[PDB]
Paper text:
A highly-conserved meiosis-specific structure, the chromosome axis, assembles in early meiotic prophase and provides a scaffold for the organization of chromosomes as a linear array of loops, and also orchestrates the formation of DSBs and their repair as inter-homolog crossovers. Mammals possess two such proteins, SYCP2 (1500 residues in Mus musculus) and SYCP3 (254 residues), which are both required for proper axis formation and wild-type levels of crossovers, and are known to interact with one another through their C-terminal coiled-coil domains. Mammalian SYCP3 is known to form coiled-coil homotetramers that self-associate into larger structures both in cell culture and in vitro, but how SYCP3 cooperates with SYCP2 to mediate chromosome localization and axis assembly is not known. We further show that both SYCP2/SYCP3 and ASY3/ASY4 form heterotetrameric coiled-coil complexes that self-assemble into extended filaments, paralleling our findings with Red1.
We combined the truncations on both proteins to yield a minimal construct, Mm SYCP21325-1479:SYCP3105-248, which we term SYCP2CC:SYCP3CC hereon. As SYCP2 and SYCP3 share limited sequence homology in their coiled-coil region, we reasoned that SYCP3 homotetramers may form through promiscuous coiled-coil interactions in the absence of SYCP2. To compare the stability of Mm SYCP3CC homotetramers with Mm SYCP2CC:SYCP3CC heterotetramers, we measured their melting temperatures (Tm) using a dye-binding assay. Overall, these data show that the SYCP2CC:SYCP3CC complex forms an extended coiled-coil tetramer with an overall structure similar to that of the SYCP3 homotetramer. In agreement with our SAXS data, the crosslinking data strongly support a heterotetramer model with two SYCP2 monomers arranged parallel to one another and antiparallel to two SYCP3 monomers.
Numbering used by the authors:
A (entry chain D): 115 to 211, 218 to 237
B (entry chain C): 105 to 211, 219 to 234
C (entry chain B): 111 to 215, 221 to 238
D (entry chain A): 108 to 238
Write the structure that this text describes.
């Protein structure tokens, strides 16, 4: 059956060369596909790390917010004191005060006047 | 009696002009207190409003922190799904490729089986 | 002779269908992969553009925060100007009172008249 | 004659002692208000610095955000650049495959035609080997 076997191989050749074509096309695709898919995962990473940076820039601006608050609150309190003391310390000045030291200078002047009469 | 009249008169004269001089001072020092009273109130009323300012600043910022908690939690999920689709297609592709790979490995046994039927039928 | 042409043609029919089947088995694979692929890609596209919307959302939360800061600064500035002025007007108005008080030391009038009284009442 | 001289000069000295009393008191008050003015103004100068330090920080943080926002937007350009890139590759894949199929279907030079030919070529060979 040599005639049958010779034409049996000539058919499979027809087949497999055809199928070889389709496979070379799939290899080329895959290779190309996976290459670009790989660098795409890299860029996808940076794009999330840039999502990070912005989201950190806000939390930073949040901290500023509270620091200013505290600062504001510390300044107002320092002023209030300074003022409360000033007021206290004038109240002590009023207690230190003279209208009798006036009576004394007046009394003396009275003595002086009586004498010379 | 004459002398004792004049003693009394000057003592009187001095008392009265004591009260005068002391009222003079009293009136000024009270003018002064009015200025300082008016001052510290004005003063206090601005410290009062600086404190309202600070609280309305707090509340406005407390509300941003909550809004940012929201947008961040969504943005984080949005970020997780993008890596998930990433895993999904790499898999769809790798599968499609093994299937075509396995298809080739399986590929032919019916061709020879037909030739053998045919040859047997030609015999 | 005539039979073998008949079996030959039947054999060619089975071969043809064998080839056509597998060919159609490949292209079902190619079509189901390329349909999946497209479905995800379109999806992932939307889920990419959704990240931007969340990102543009944050730069608006950012500019809002910045806007809050400009107003607290302006107000703080305006408050400090109010207070510096109240204090300045205070100080000034003490200076003003101190001038009117060089009139008071009035005491010299009291002391004159007292003298005159005492003088006349012993001379 | 000497009496009248004694009462004048006694009143004057008594008068400048009264005035001096009032004077000292007023200087004492003045010194307080001075100090308080200093302490006050000191806290105003700090508060003024605090304002401008807050502003400088937030002005810097906003530029960092400007820059990082551009850097972000370029990264979306990159993303959709990979989209098109991948879409093309797959599309050209499918084109390549339909071309391969169209060529494998040519009635004259397809793969069935090459099959039939060799089949007929076997048949002709088998029937002359009998005759």
């Amino acid at each position: 059956k040599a005639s049958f076997k010779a034409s049996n191989q000539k058919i499979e050749q027809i087949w497999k060369t055809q199928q070889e074509e389709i496979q070379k096309l799939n290899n080329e695709y895959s290779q190309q596909f996976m290459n670009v898919l790989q660098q795409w995962e890299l860029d996808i990473q940076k794009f999330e790390e840039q999502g990070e940076k912005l989201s950190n820039l806000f939390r930073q601006q949040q901290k500023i917010f509270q620091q200013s608050r505290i600062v504001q609150s510390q300044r107002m309190k320092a002023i209030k004191q300074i003022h409360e003391q000033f007021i206290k310390s004038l109240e002590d000045v009023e207690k230190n005060n003279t209208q009798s030291e006036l009576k004394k200078e007046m009394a003396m002047l009275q003595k002086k006047v009586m004498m010379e009469t």
